[PDB]
Design a protein around this ligand. Structure first.
Ligand code: HEM
Ligand SMILES: N[C@@H](Cc1c[nH]c2ccccc12)C(=O)O
Ligand SMILES: OCCc1c[nH]c2ccccc12
Ligand SMILES: [C-]#N
Length: 378
């Protein structure tokens, strides 16, 4: 399902530079801070050629092109970020992006898989994976803190993906009726999620609230139920009409949905607005990751197994994992308070996320549903 023991769902060292045929593309993406502040970005994209996508070799190259075309499309649509919006996207950039998006089974807009999972490099390949030894490929503006913002996600993915290699043990242990193995395995998955919470903490160090809310957040925004492009973005040449597509969010990460599926926390059940979002966001993941969540869903329920056995140590191990998810979501709400709610209040009905959710009801519903799945002695 394209999963690595070392790095998780991220590409193990993604493609940094394209074939030379797409040098028009790579120049605009690499120098986005300057071109946007100059006010000359839109002319530079409007004055382009319609480059055909046939000469992109493999998956790693196509995933860099997604990121290049995606970043460019955001810089073009939003502009300097003040209100001057572009409701129509040029035929020269839009058609190859739509064609590349249809080939990779993704929507034509920047997603988590682009701007986090394909948007990094190792400085000194020998040394271990960390904030000092890592750097993003692309930023949007100067002082947008995109290095810290994107890489904190990637490091939390990596921390959480230590658990993903334990999953086959869990289902093998249930199938073979091996209780002690299943107990050990669940505690290891809990241990990984606790360590993922510690990796989360550094967002305060590497990301400034005002920088995030006012500068960066507008470039991660999309155009599905967005007042600025209410009908949607027009992909000229490729599509007849405007088309709505949700903006980027960590809700588009597979790691952060898979533990709910693993543990039998039914976030996607019920038909309410939150479940609908979390399901819909699986179409904003690359197909291999969508299949991982699928495969995991098709397995027998760990929850049902644990409740059936009348076993305290097994229930407690299971609860460790659920607690860890509740801790992450509770902390994420504190991050939302510092990085959205307070910044929004210093700005001269319902607050909307970049993905389009009613964020405070949404997030608390998702945390609530997680808490309800705590067993507590059967
Ligand atoms: C400045 C930092 C952050 C802000 C302001 C923020 C804000 C939000 C918002 C508003 C949503 C609701 C969905 C939407 O409409 O977009 C959301 C969902 C989510 N965020 Fe974040 N977020 C941040 C960082 C993170 C990080 C670092 C992670 C994980 C490593 C994360 C994981 C999630 C997940 C998994 C969801 C989906 C709902 C859930 O399962 O709890 N977020 N976030
Ligand atoms: N949904 C967040 C933005 C966000 C947080 N983490 C992300 C990761 C990728 C893309 C977007 C995001 C907001 O409304 O502010
Ligand atoms: O909202 C908290 C973010 C989150 C949900 N599930 C996860 C699993 C691993 C790491 C972070 C998360
Ligand atoms: C978090 N989006």
């Amino acid at each position: 399902y394209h999963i690595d023991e070392e790095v998780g769902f991220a590409l193990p060292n993604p493609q940094e530079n394209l074939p030379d045929f797409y040098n028009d593309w790579m120049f605009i993406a690499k120098h986005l801070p300057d071109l946007i502040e100059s006010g000359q970005l839109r002319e530079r994209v409007e004055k382009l050629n319609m480059l055909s996508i046939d000469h992109l070799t493999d998956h790693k190259s196509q995933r860099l092109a997604r990121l290049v075309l995606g970043c460019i499309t955001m810089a073009y649509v939003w502009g300097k970020g003040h209100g001057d919006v572009r409701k129509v996207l040029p035929r020269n950039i839009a058609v190859p992006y739509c064609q590349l998006s249809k080939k990779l089974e993704l929507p034509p807009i920047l997603v988590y898989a682009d701007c986090v999972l394909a948007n990094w490099k190792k400085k000194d390949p020998n040394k271990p994976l960390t904030y000092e030894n890592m750097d993003v490929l692309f930023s949007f503006r100067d002082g947008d803190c995109s290095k810290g913002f994107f890489l904190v996600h990637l490091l939390v993915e990596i921390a959480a993906a230590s658990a993903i290699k334990v999953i086959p043990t869990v289902f093998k242990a249930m199938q073979m009726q091996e209780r002690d193995t299943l107990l050990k395995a669940l505690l290891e998955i809990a241990s990984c999620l606790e360590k993922a919470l510690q990796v989360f903490h550094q967002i305060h160090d590497h990301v400034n609230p005002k920088a995030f809310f006012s500068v960066l957040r507008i470039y991660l925004s999309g155009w599905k139920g967005n007042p600025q492009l209410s009908d949607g973005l027009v992909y000229e040449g490729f599509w007849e009409d405007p088309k709505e597509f949700a903006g980027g969010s960590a809700g588009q990460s597979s790691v952060f949905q898979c533990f709910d599926v693993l543990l039998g926390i039914q976030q996607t059940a019920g038909g309410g607005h939150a479940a609908q979002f979390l399901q819909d966001m699986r179409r904003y993941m690359p197909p291999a990751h969508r299949n991982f969540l699928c495969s995991l869903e098709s397995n027998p329920s760990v929850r049902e197994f644990v409740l059936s056995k009348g076993d305290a140590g097994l229930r407690e191990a299971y609860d460790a994992c659920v607690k860890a998810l509740v801790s992450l979501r509770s902390y994420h709400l504190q991050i939302v308070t510092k990085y959205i709610l307070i910044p929004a209040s210093q700005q001269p009905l319902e607050a909307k996320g970049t993905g389009g959710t009613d964020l405070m009801n949404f997030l608390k519903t998702v945390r609530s549903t997680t808490e309800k799945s705590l067993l507590k002695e059967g």
